[model samples]
Every structure is written in structure tokens, then in C-alpha cells.
Target: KVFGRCELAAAMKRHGLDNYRGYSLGNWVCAAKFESNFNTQATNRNTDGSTDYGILQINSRWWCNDGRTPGSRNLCNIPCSALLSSDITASVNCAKKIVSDGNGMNAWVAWRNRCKGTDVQAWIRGCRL
Candidate 1:
């Protein structure tokens, strides 16, 4: 679905990122659209018959869910859903914190690096936001 400013803002707010700079949120939203069509229920099958699930592209085995991996659910202190909720701001912010500390700008930099030159918004996306 096409998201507007307020829609994106609600997403950021859910993840304690109500103050997100905008462009970053747009970038991540674009990334999510390209990555998995923003399907929070998305899942992929592994060669070992295992399954990876969620919108953040979280793996069940990697979390404390049904699969048998490391800590599973509570390893990152929050579920993948919580991290990748409809609140893009909250989801990405949580993901960014999990990657770094609380540095949203740094997180955007990293995201842009991985998604540069693509439709994922890259640095320009974040800057305009």
C-alpha cells in the first residue's frame, strides 16, 4: 500500500522514533517494499526444512520462536514483529538500535550503504527526509 507522511510517522512513533528525520523512514519503507512487499507474515524456507519469518526478515530459528536456534525470541530484547511493526519508524529504529545503539542517523548511513544505487532510497532518500 502507498504510505503517506502521517502513516509513516505513526510507524516511527511505535518504535520510539517519533523524531525520525523523515528521509530515513522513507528509505527503509522503500527497502521493506522491495525486500518483502512489507509482509509481516512473510517467511522463507531453508535447505534444512527450517523457516524464516516476519517483516524485518527475522528468522524463527534465530529467535526464540518455534525453531531451535540460539535464544530465539528474546535474544534481541524484542520480537521481530515489534521491530518491524507497521510503524516503520519504530521498526527501523529498533532495528537500528539493535545494530548500533540509539543512533538513527548512523543506522540510516548503514542502510543506505547496503541499499545504495538501488530503489531503496540510499543516502538521498534519508537526506530529503
Candidate 2:
């Protein structure tokens, strides 16, 4: 399922990203916008044979483990397939884990390039939290 921007905003807040990790709801919403365009099942193949999964693009390189990678980092400790669900819980939980466990929002380069240093309020303006 592809999420509308406002839908993503409310859903993000519902999942605890509002003011989470000292970042605003807009921060979370905006990163999802740029990272996976709010799609429930997006994946991106990278140069190092790693893949980014789901709306927040949790990466196989660090967050999700497929159990076959030689140098795997399963910080989220869930299957790489977990983040691909439309249910959003696993995806959002892992996102929260990445931020809370040291990586913070900077884990997503799209967040720095497009979401940081801006009034991402527009990302959630019409959505009532």
C-alpha cells in the first residue's frame, strides 16, 4: 500500500514518532516521503549488495538480517522481510529502534538531504495529531 502524505503523518504519530527521539512528527513523515515515497513494500538495491526495505528503507546492511550475509548487522533483529509489510508496525518499530539505539534520524541520508533544516510541518499540516 502506498500511503498518502497525510495518512503517513497520522500513522507515524500513532506509532510514536511524534516528538520521538527529539525529532518532530514532520521529521519522521518527511523522511518517509523521500526515502520510500510512503510505500509499504519499497526496496532499493545499493552498491554494496545491501537492500533498503519498506517506507523508511530499513537497510539490510544494518537493520534487517537475512541470515546469509557474510557481514550482517541485525540491529533490528527481524527478518529483512519483516519491514516489507503493509501493516506498518514492524516497519515503524524498527525505525524507532534505529533512532533510539544510536543511529538517530541520520541513519537515512534522505532525511539529512531533504527533511533536515526545514519546516517539514507541511508534511503534516492537514493531519490532526
Candidate 3:
């Protein structure tokens, strides 16, 4: 299940990415899958295991805001709670944020490179999905 629920799919559909393409999206999906099987309840701590939630594995303290509070530009503000969360939007925005960084797409390229076990920027640039 995408984002471990249907609402996330709805949110993504509303945002025009229900069926997204591109190396960036691919990288994000693959990374997330590897990190937590796309599960919203995954976590990893430095010592033992940390608590991570939502599609992006957002931690409460790192991005909880306050009992599902709203009104903030922080990435933490993205709702990860499935009942009415913004994790889906946050994931899309995260990609946009990185792409708009003016770093010559280095971030995306690097992710693709490492994820694919090769420095394949040109291939990634030409990738259709």
C-alpha cells in the first residue's frame, strides 16, 4: 500500500503524482522501500531503534509539531498521521525542494548514483521513470 494507506494515494493523485515518473521519484520510492518497505511505522535509532512514522518515516519530535498541529513551514509540519496527514504532499514537496536547490541536480544525481551503485547521472537524466 502506498504510504500504508489509501488517503496518501488520494493526496498524491490530487497533487498530480498518483502515477509519477522520473529518476527522482524512483529514487525516493526505492529509498523509502529499502528503509521501511514503505511502511509508515518504521524506525531506526542510533543506539538500538528509533521511532519513525509515515511514508517518509518522519519522527514525531522531528516533525510532529504538536498533537497534529498545523501552520508552519518546517518539513516537520508535514502531517504523517494517516487520519489527516500531509506526508504524501511532503514527499512530493521534498523532491521539488531538492530539484529546485540550483545544485545542478547534484542531489538527485547522487541519490540515483548511490542507489544504482554507479555514477549514472546521464542515464538518470534520460530515465523516463
- By TM-score, the best candidate is 2
Please give each candidate's TM-score: 0.48, 0.93, 0.41
Can you write out model 3's per-residue Cα lDDT over 1-129, one digit (the tens) per residue?
Answer: 446333433444466543344443344544454545556555443232323454545444334432432342334454444412434565555545444545423443324445555433332243333
Better of 1 and 2 by TM-score: 2
- Best candidate (score: lDDT): 2
Query: What RMSD, rounded to one decimal, does every model reach?
Result: 6.0, 1.3, 7.6
Model 2 per-residue lDDT tens digits across residues 15-117: 8888988999989889999999999889898888888899999888888897656597998889989988878889888888888877688888999889899
Clashing pairs in 2: none
Candidate 3 global CA lDDT score: 0.43
Cα-based lDDT for every prediction: 0.46, 0.87, 0.43
Candidate 3: residue pairs that collide = 44-50, 45-50, 79-86
Q: Clash number for model 3?
A: 3
Error of 3 at 88 (Å): 2.9
**What's model 3's lDDT at 52?**
45
